[PDB]
Design a protein around this ligand. Sequence first.
Ligand code: HEM
Ligand code: HEM
Ligand code: 1QF
Ligand code: 1QF
Ligand code: H4B
Ligand code: H4B
Ligand code: ZN
Lengths: 403, 405
Amino acid sequence: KFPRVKNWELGSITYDTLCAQSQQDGPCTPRRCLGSLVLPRPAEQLLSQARDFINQYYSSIKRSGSQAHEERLQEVEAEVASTGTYHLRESELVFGAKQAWRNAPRCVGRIQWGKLQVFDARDCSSAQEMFTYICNHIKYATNRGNLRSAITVFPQRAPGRGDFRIWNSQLVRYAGYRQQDGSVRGDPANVEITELCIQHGWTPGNGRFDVLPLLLQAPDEAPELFVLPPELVLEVPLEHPTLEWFAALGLRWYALPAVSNMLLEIGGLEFSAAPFSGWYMSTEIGTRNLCDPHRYNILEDVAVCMDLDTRTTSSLWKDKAAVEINLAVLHSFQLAKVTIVDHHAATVSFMKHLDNEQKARGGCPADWAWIVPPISGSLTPVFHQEMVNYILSPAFRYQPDPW
Amino acid sequence: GPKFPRVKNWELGSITYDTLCAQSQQDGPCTPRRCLGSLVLPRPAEQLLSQARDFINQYYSSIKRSGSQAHEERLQEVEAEVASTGTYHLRESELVFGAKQAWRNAPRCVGRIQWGKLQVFDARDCSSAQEMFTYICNHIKYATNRGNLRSAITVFPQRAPGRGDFRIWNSQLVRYAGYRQQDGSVRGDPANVEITELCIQHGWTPGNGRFDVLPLLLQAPDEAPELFVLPPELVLEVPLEHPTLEWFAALGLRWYALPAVSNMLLEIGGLEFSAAPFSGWYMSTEIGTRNLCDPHRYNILEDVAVCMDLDTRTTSSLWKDKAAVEINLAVLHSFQLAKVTIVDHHAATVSFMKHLDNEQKARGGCPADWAWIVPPISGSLTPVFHQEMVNYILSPAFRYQPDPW
Ligand code: HEM
Ligand code: HEM
Ligand SMILES: CCN(CCc1ccc(NC(=N)c2cccs2)cc1)Cc1cccc(NC(=N)c2cccs2)c1
Ligand SMILES: CCN(CCc1ccc(NC(=N)c2cccs2)cc1)Cc1cccc(NC(=N)c2cccs2)c1
Ligand SMILES: C[C@H](O)[C@H](O)[C@H]1CNc2nc(N)[nH]c(=O)c2N1
Ligand SMILES: C[C@H](O)[C@H](O)[C@H]1CNc2nc(N)[nH]c(=O)c2N1
Ligand SMILES: [Zn+2]
């Protein structure tokens, strides 16, 4: 049955019919809902995903049923039948990557989905070559602060060999040094990748914001270390518009969010290295990366500097310091002329995206827990919006760490 | 290893498995194809008897006499009663256990650390609307307790074959009127426009303030509902002021002390208690964020931001977030000064994490609805944001039921 989806702020109702196109089960059953969980627990097969994807592509260019369309299905069928796999055309890759982004339930920035620079790096044959492509991507996407969404697609997985992989989770990550007494200097999210880099020969620094080298792996070979040229990594020193001491914290963040550990699936084909980037929403830095207790955890230091009463939850010291930290992020990115979006503007644009998608496809897969921001939830319109979560393909998926 | 949902806390890195979810006899709204966890309201003798047996088994376990002669006699008692009457009745101690178990079972409630501390008023002898009113007044007096709030539920007679239901028409025992204006806007609380107009259709003379307490519309079986005005001195309110912003008091904002939900159905062993109002105390974000700042509620964010001299013309000033924080602080400071029990969202969520741990050991899981448990401001500043949760329906339960009109 198609779900009724209600907006509680405005009282309007839509029906999601797009969900009938989901050929892939999520974690929930009628007995229990597992929607808040972060992670999940042959020829005819590939051939049906492939045909379905070819159909999606030709439909998008309005040329369904054409000679072009029928001949491409035969190509795909001939290639699978003989070889057990096939290959996308550049234009199909481009359509498939944009559609994977369109389809991502956890992304609040999908209003932008049509505007994606696609770099084809399927002719890559060494870690060395991956490095060059990654540098060009960083260069293109950063654009001196006028950030532009981009994805670089490396060669697909193949039955008879190891995957191309970027070991780092982002192209830009700060090091995390474990002390002999369990504590962390830097970003505790990155302790494990930091130790991998050292163990593969990297000379470590000892500051709070040391940029990591990349560990890049060509099929069935040990990964290789590649330091990014400092000029390629744009960073933003953080200051506050009115609190002078805030700059004295020595806080900074990188401009470019570039996810490099997800698998891109198109038409049954899987791209194990396909790093993508856009721009940040301020709460990702301001709230999560700087205030999570298991991240940089700076809320207490900011509260002391602000002279808040830290001894009781009911002074709302956490809330006040978080807000100022998020304001600092926005102010500093704006001063540095680096693209960023606040959570109000971002969620307003997502509401427009939902409406666009309702008209265009009869629904939009969205994961409420990830779309609603991590401060000021009900102050944004997405909090009051019901949403339906399901897996469409093309898709960005999680995959195992390669070590 | 374990064939049960794996539940992770991403802050602490710890893992549990929910085995309680196996005791669920009732489907939620989700399927393998699509998750509907974010939807607010997604859409016979042997049936009764099996619900009844299960509940009686739950009761006897709770007092550690599973399989005893007292247990097998009670089962026989219940089937005999259903056999001859089509229904059955709860012993007093069974009603008490079942009302606490329903609270304990409520996936949307963050206050469940307190579940064992509930005063159960048994009003199953009530036979008129006038008498419901007396019971409700007594409930309010007990629960309010001059500011030192005490959790309580009052249980009216269960649904009976043919005979009409006891119903309270109001969604809460205390609600502010919402008066639709000529210009199409609302004075008072827009959530209550419908109950306000029903009160007027039923003979209430309306006021015209922003905070007029509504009368109760109480319905006894097969009768038109009757109207009762709460004695003003029974409805404790808290005027709002801010600890440092001296002008906030000039806004004339207020909220009532006692949140008492009155339109939910309490189901125990298949029995249906259609009138069963319950009350605890507020978490401060219900007032300061949702009630006062929702755009479809009092919607005061812009007014407060203007008094704070914020830049309301641009989202990136964070004017909304700063105003909301101060409004929340005013709510906490004002309740505190008035000595009325309230809990802030940090203290509530921390205590809910303790609840989760207690329930892991006691029952092997805790049904919880993440979207409702995470507070509406400062989500990820609370420990519940980082905690995975498995949502499912256990019984006894508090359920939604259609409006009586
Ligand atoms: C253009 C600006 C964009 C903004 C502001 C944005 C915003 C976000 C945010 C805030 C998240 C949640 C991230 C987190 O909590 O860690 C996210 C998730 C995601 N976005 Fe975007 N997005 C943008 C562009 C893109 C692009 C270009 C892609 C891919 C081509 C993409 C795909 C994703 C995916 C796959 C996720 C989910 C990651 C996961 O499940 O762990 N987004 N987006
Ligand atoms: C002891 C103090 C308590 C606190 C701080 C508290 C907190 C809350 C909060 C914040 C909500 C969400 C309300 C909303 O967003 O509108 C809630 C929901 C709920 N609580 Fe409590 N709770 C308390 C006691 C109780 C008691 C005594 C009961 C019943 C015996 C109860 C049963 C419920 C139920 C059934 C819901 C779900 C409402 C719905 O789905 O519409 N809680 N609780
Ligand atoms: C895949 C990693 N995401 C973050 C991805 C991400 C997506 C988007 C952004 N932000 C952006 N604005 C953009 C990035 C790229 C385009 S826009 C930032 C990060 C978080 C995540 C999801 C699921 C599981 C995990 N896993 C973990 N946290 C683990 C730690 C140790 C073992 S597993 C992490
Ligand atoms: C049943 C009403 N709940 C809120 C109940 C509630 C529970 C708890 C509290 N707060 C408390 N702290 C307590 C109250 C009692 C004990 S603790 C306040 C309110 C909200 C809700 C949920 C689902 C649907 C609706 N209904 C609707 N909004 C509508 C339907 C049709 C038109 S409007 C309302
Ligand atoms: C347990 C819970 O699902 C988890 O903390 C989620 C909640 N919402 C999120 N939302 C976003 N955007 N990013 C996240 O990492 C998370 N974490
Ligand atoms: C659409 C969404 O489910 C809805 O706005 C929910 C979200 N979480 C909530 N959480 C609580 N505690 N109370 C609510 O009314 C809601 N509303
Ligand atoms: Zn679900």
